[PDB]
Amino acid sequence: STPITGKVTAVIGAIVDVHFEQSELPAILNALEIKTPQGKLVLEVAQHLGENTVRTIAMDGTEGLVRGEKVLDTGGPISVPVGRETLGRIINVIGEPIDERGPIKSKLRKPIHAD
Amino acid sequence: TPITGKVTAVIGAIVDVHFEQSELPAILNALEIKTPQGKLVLEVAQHLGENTVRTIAMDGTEGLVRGEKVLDTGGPISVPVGRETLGRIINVIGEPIDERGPIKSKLRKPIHAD
Amino acid sequence: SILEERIKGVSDEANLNETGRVLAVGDGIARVFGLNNIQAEELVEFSSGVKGMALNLEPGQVGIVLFGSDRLVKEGELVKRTGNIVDVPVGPGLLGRVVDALGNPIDGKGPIDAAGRSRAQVKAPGILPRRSVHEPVQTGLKAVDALVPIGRGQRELIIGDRQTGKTAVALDTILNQKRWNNGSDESKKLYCVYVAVGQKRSTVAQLVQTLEQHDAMKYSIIVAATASEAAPLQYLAPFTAASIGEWFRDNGKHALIVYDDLSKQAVAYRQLSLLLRRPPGREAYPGDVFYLHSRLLERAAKLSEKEGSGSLTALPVIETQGGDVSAYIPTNVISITDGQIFLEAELFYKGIRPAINVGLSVSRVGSAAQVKALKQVAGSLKLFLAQYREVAAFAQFGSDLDASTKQTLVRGERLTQLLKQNQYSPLATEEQVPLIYAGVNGHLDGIELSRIGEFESSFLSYLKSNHNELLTEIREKGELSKELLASLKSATESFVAT
Amino acid sequence: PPPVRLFGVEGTYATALYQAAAKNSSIDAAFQSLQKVESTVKKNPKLGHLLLNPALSLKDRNSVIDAIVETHKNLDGYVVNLLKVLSENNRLGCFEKIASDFGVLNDAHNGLLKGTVTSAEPLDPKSFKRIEKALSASKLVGQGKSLKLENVVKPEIKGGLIVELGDKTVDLSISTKIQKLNKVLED
Secondary structure, three states: OOOOOOOEEEEOEEEEEEOOOOOOOOOOOOOOEEEOOOOOEEEEEEEEEEOOOOEEEEOOOOOOEOOOEEEOOOOOOOEEEEOOOOOOOOOOOOOOOOOOOOOOOOOEEEEOOOO | OOOEEEEEEEEOOEEEHHHHHHHHOOOOEEEOOOOOOOEEEEEEEEEOOOEEEEEEEEOOOOOOOOOOEEEEEEOOOEEOOOOOOOOOOOOOOEOOOHHHOOOOOOOEEEEEOO | OHHHHHHHOOOOOOOOOOOEEEEEEOOOOEEEEEOOOOEEOOOOOOEOEEEEEEEEEEOOOOOEEEEOOOOOOOOOEEEEEEEOOOOEEEOOHOOEEEEEEOOOOOOOOOOOOOOOOEEOOOOOOOOOOOOOOOOOOOOOOOOHHOOEEEEEEOOOEOOOOOOOOOOHHHHHHHHOHHHHHHHOOOOOEEEEEEEEEEEEEHHHHHHHHHHHHOOOOOEEEEEEEEEOOOOOHHHHHHHHHHHHHHHHHHHEEEEOOOOEEEHHHHHHHHHHHHHOOOOOHHHHHHOOOOOOOHHOOOOOOOOOOOOOOOOOEEEEEEOOOOOOOOOOOHHHHHHOOOEEEEEOOOOOOOOOOOOOOOHHHOOOOHHHHOOOHHHOOOOOHHHHHHHHHHHHHHHHHOOOOOOOHHHHHHHHHHHHHOOOEOOOOOOOOHHHHHHHHHHOOOOOOOHHHHHHHHHHHHHHHHHHHHHHHHHHHHHHHOOOEEEHHHHHHHHHHHHHOO | OOOOOOOOOOHHHHHHHHHHHHHHHHHHHHHHHHHHHHHHHOOHHHHHHHHHHOOHHHHHHHHHHHHHOOOOOOOOOHHHHHHHHOOOOOOOOOHHHHHHHHHHHHHHOOOEEEEEEOOOOOOOHHHHHHHHHHOOOOOOOOOOOOOOEEEEEEEOOOOOOEEEEOEEEEEEEHHHHHHHHHHOOOO
16 A cells, blocks of 8 residues: 555546545555556546646546545656667567567656657 | 425526426426416426426416425326317317317327437 | 434435435436445336446435436335346347347347356457458458458458448348358358347348348348437447457357447446446547547457467448547547548449448558458559559640550549449459459440440350359469469450440 | 735635634633534544545535534534535535635634744754754844744755744755855856
């Protein structure tokens, strides 16, 4: 878990609103992971709306979401892998291999947002 | 049914009633507001809850005093049909216009149908 | 004490997990007070019998889209979570059956022989699961086959103004698949799934009768969601049709899925979004309209040896009401799809009926899905036509143009007339190869425009009688040998004119 | 005008009722007794958890009157009218909200103030008193107004201190100073 535990409040589509614990708010552009049998669904925090209720946009797909579902926080922008070991392989948005030559094992990772 | 209510609001011809029974006449039921305008035919289209429905009003809402009794027709408007409706001109309320007297009808049917 | 007892007395006394009591009714979209634990997209059985899936899980009050009428619904009722996301029977029993959205046979040939159940959304086959396409399929419309060759796994968007035989274009494809249907191989056999959304029961009924007449109803599945039938059910109708398709594909068997029309699907989702108060996009079609369409269309594939070997072929259809392709829904779809099969209204009146305007028709997948023989013959069919289009445009003036341009003009005119297609007539590819050879090798350039129609019928007959050796070979070898081309050359010449 | 404008969203109508409690001025003591009514709501919360439950109409208003019959009468006729008003507006989720806000107005009239000295870590009690003293020996607590200085622990609010009270702070934390040091040595 994390003290930044949020419980979904509203799934109205890609928009999924989460109700993080008071005084334990995340920051805009963070990456939330929700443990799921589909892997971890990543929701990008895009607003704070008040009293530790955020409105986040889903990155990956949604369905069967239990409203009130605990939300762990990665704490920041999605971290891809970087390296020359990212050469010659298919990678996806969250950085997962599509060629399935196993995990893109790399020395370093970097966030998606960079200045 | 003898479910009465009063007219809380009169926003256009989309009157809102506040029924006393928490049984609110189902969607597509019909209501008569008892007035010197005869009846006014309304058809429940939303229940806004709180025992306050919001009703489409088919007949004119002019002169409505707020808090005016309603009576529940209890279902979709029952038209008059028959082979003796042949040669009759009927209004929306299902009543003559050509005054070939009261509509000779045996069976009266709900306006909505599947 | 007394107040706590009395409080318990006026209180519901249910935690409203698995249940919740309706509150505020109307607009065919409900709102329930309760349902604290609920899974998304789950099916909830309202205790007025009606069942409704849930699309808004807004705090404390779940916005549940009914699959039925709200006239059945009365506020304050309980809704009890079915606990199942929507699912459909899928099976080979659908062959020769019309089914409604929930799969209930509306043809009334009784319960489907359903070899499975499926889930409303089933994810598209990945990069690796697909085989690289090389599966030709021919619609029996020469212009389509030649100019925009159709393969299996690709999406080709049939677009053009409404009911200008919009239906009829699709049905032509189905009829030529008889040639494959007769054929024993399952990779040949397309189990064709025609989806009719928003369309009236009478139209569909006429269509099934036509299919029965043409005896293709057998290998046909008709998935229908008529106009009356619910807006969620209409939205759900392509995706559960798709599931039936994935099952064929998975089985290794090939199929073709017609989605006519996606445009009414968009209107349905629009209705839902505007009565779920969800933000409506451009033209009031919601922000995640693209998400629906893209996932549906990308489910089409041809599979490798990883799984199956089947291929679902897709033909999406958008009827452009305005005829405006720059509208949000056509634009979104156009980007998604691998082709456009633009039709022109003016050319319909010009006498091509159906009329296909191939200026805005593309098939990016191309002639790897085109028969080798047919690739050869229609090779410069394109060049001549392309020249004809430009040449014809200047040529209307009525001036006596330079002869080289009028060589084009004269040849080009004959080609258009040659191409002309008549409704309810599919053409055999073996007997489309001669006509395109004849034209391309210019044996019909001389033949007068007026009698091109006369010549065509006779020519086929003359070959059928005499050069029937040629026809057998075209079918048998599917690529034309030099010898066969020469033989064909002589043959065309042999029937100098009718 | 009530001491301090809340801005008053919903509960602010009840803050105007607190102005009426100053007007019929026994309503100032009515704010103490209404704090006793909030204490009754603090005994309530099994029923209060049911009270966040929607849909109690005229029967909900009668049920609220039954809870009021369990009560002794703290906040009087203004409180009874507020019970009817909140019943009429049908919301228990801004029931305690009005309570907190009425509390702010009440303790504003009393003149009590609330400060805080968020720091990375807890601070001495000697420190607590010395800052409360300091605040009294500054214009911030002009004296005539009380203070409840609460040190809060928030290591996220890095080393040093931040004192807060009014719209006035002194922030002698580490992070801000480090920030400034860095910036100029990147210039």
